[PDB]
Write a protein that binds this ligand. Structure first.
Ligand SMILES: CNCc1ccc2c(c1)N(C(=O)OCC(F)(F)F)[C@H](CNC(=N)N)[C@H]2NC(=O)C(=O)Nc1ccc(Cl)c(F)c1
Ligand SMILES: *[C@@H]1O[C@H](CO)[C@@H](O)[C@H](O)[C@H]1NC(C)=O
Ligand SMILES: *[C@@H]1O[C@H](CO)[C@@H](O)[C@H](O)[C@H]1NC(C)=O
Ligand SMILES: *[C@@H]1O[C@H](CO)[C@@H](O)[C@H](O)[C@H]1NC(C)=O
Ligand SMILES: *[C@@H]1O[C@H](CO)[C@@H](O)[C@H](O)[C@H]1NC(C)=O
Ligand SMILES: *[C@@H]1O[C@H](CO)[C@@H](O)[C@H](O)[C@H]1NC(C)=O
Ligand SMILES: *[C@@H]1O[C@H](CO)[C@@H](O)[C@H](O)[C@H]1NC(C)=O
Length: 335
């Protein structure tokens, strides 16, 4: 309804680029926020029509533009060239704050699906701290659901609408390019993944009850969305998930169909230099990988899914506003 500002705990002495940007663009966090509960009030939220998402999206576009400059940017006809130094890159949390005369309403119902009325409501100065993690298929390093796994969608009947799965237990994913210089891999504990897809299938079954629930790899599209793509220490990883989204949940039981060994699923990855941009329609070209071992140890805290008797779910993504939504869903700005 207005323009928010961000608070961060960044340093102006970190060269890490989220820190540099936040030093320029955000104010320091207030060391003890105020919060004002109101369990009588009951108000309506719609995480899918939320202007905080747009404001944050603009911020992260600006952050990536100041911080991850490509050597070449191709948008439409024009090509833009510039210095593309390697940088230290590691997302830091950002708080979104309502300005004077304006408050942020937080919904505190632990099972709120992002939409409709919510009974127990607070007012706050700022949101919690959100790391702005750009990725497809898997949401990484977010905050977990507190009770059960929540299925969020603007419209579950409309299979073209992205489904956000909010996990209550994170699943570790470790990706490294070890000391081909483009080739890398990720490890996931098959048991932990197994378990979580068991319970995701449970919740999806509540919403599609006659149906067998299948998980299958992303059909087609650009590589950014047919793989799990993300940025790790400045490098762009593209990790094949066909051994990950590969399983059936039949009669209250999940069976993993993807290949593992020693009880870990291993994703084959490539580090790429030509990137289809999430910010706009265009391509970006970066320098070859920095040298040595490149490793990110992340928590999977959510999934992005697309639905095609049987219901089939494939990993999705590509619109980074859904990544922000998955964190801003409980917040509305008012007054
Ligand atoms: C969810 N609906 C379907 C869909 C599918 C695919 C895309 C959109 C939408 N897109 C959009 O909605 O962009 C928002 C805009 F439209 F406002 F620009 C994008 C358009 N961009 C290009 N065709 N170049 C494209 N996504 C990426 O390319 C994309 O995620 N790349 C990438 C790059 C680096 C990293 Cl680490 C990464 F993790 C991801
Ligand atoms: C979310 O809850 C509302 C009621 O508050 C319901 O109308 C809607 O269908 C639900 N959506 C999902 C994805 O469960
Ligand atoms: C997470 O949610 C699932 C399904 O909604 C539930 O069965 C499970 O008990 C929950 N686990 C934890 C650790 O809260
Ligand atoms: C969402 O689903 C379908 C679209 O196929 C349509 O009936 C309507 O837009 C929505 N329905 C509900 C119940 O919200
Ligand atoms: C992922 O790997 C499988 C088998 O190795 C292959 O068939 C598939 O085309 C790969 N997907 C992508 C997007 O590279
Ligand atoms: C599941 O994995 C196996 C090998 O790990 C592969 O042959 C199969 O095609 C995958 N499933 C789908 C639906 O792609
Ligand atoms: C997730 O957080 C950990 C700890 O801060 C970090 O090392 C890791 O690189 C992060 N992953 C991504 C993809 O940002």
């Amino acid at each position: 309804k207005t323009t928010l500002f961000c608070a961060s705990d960044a340093k102006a002495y970190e060269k890490e680029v989220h820190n540099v940007w936040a030093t320029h663009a955000c104010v320091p966090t207030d060391p003890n926020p105020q919060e004002m509960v109101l369990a009588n009030v009951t108000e309506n939220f719609n995480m899918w029509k939320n202007d905080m998402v747009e404001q944050m999206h603009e911020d992260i576009i600006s952050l990536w533009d100041e911080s991850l400059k490509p050597c070449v940017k191709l948008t439409g006809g024009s090509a833009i060239t510039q210095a593309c130094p390697k940088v230290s890159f590691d997302p830091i949390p950002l708080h979104y704050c309502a300005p004077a005369g304006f408050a942020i309403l937080k919904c505190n119902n632990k099972t709120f699906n992002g939409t409709g009325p919510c009974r127990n409501v607070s007012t706050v100065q700022c949101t919690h701290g959100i790391k702005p993690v750009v990725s497809t298929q898997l949401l990484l390093n977010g905050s977990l659901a507190e009770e059960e796994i929540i299925i969020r969608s603007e419209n579950l009947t409309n299979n073209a609408k992205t489904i956000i799965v909010h996990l209550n237990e994170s699943v570790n994913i470790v990706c490294t390019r070890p000391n081909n210089i483009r080739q890398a891999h990720c490890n996931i504990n098959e048991s932990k993944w197994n378990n979580t897809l068991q319970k995701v299938g449970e919740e999806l079954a509540k919403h599609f009850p006659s149906k067998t629930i299948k998980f299958e790899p992303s059909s087609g599209g650009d590589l950014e969305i047919t793989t799990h793509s993300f940025n790790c220490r400045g490098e762009f990883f593209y990790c094949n998930t066909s051994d990950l989204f590969n399983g059936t949940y039949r009669n209250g039981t999940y069976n993993h169909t993807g290949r593992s060994s020693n009880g870990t699923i291993t994703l084959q990855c490539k580090i790429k230099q030509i990137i289809n941009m999430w910010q706009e329609v265009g391509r970006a070209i970066y320098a070859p990988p920095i040298e040595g071992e490149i490793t990110c140890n992340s928590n999977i805290t959510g999934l992005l899914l697309l639905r095609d008797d049987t219901e089939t779910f494939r990993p999705g993504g590509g619109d980074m506003r859904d990544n922000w939504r998955s964190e801003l869903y409980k917040y509305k700005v008012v007054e």
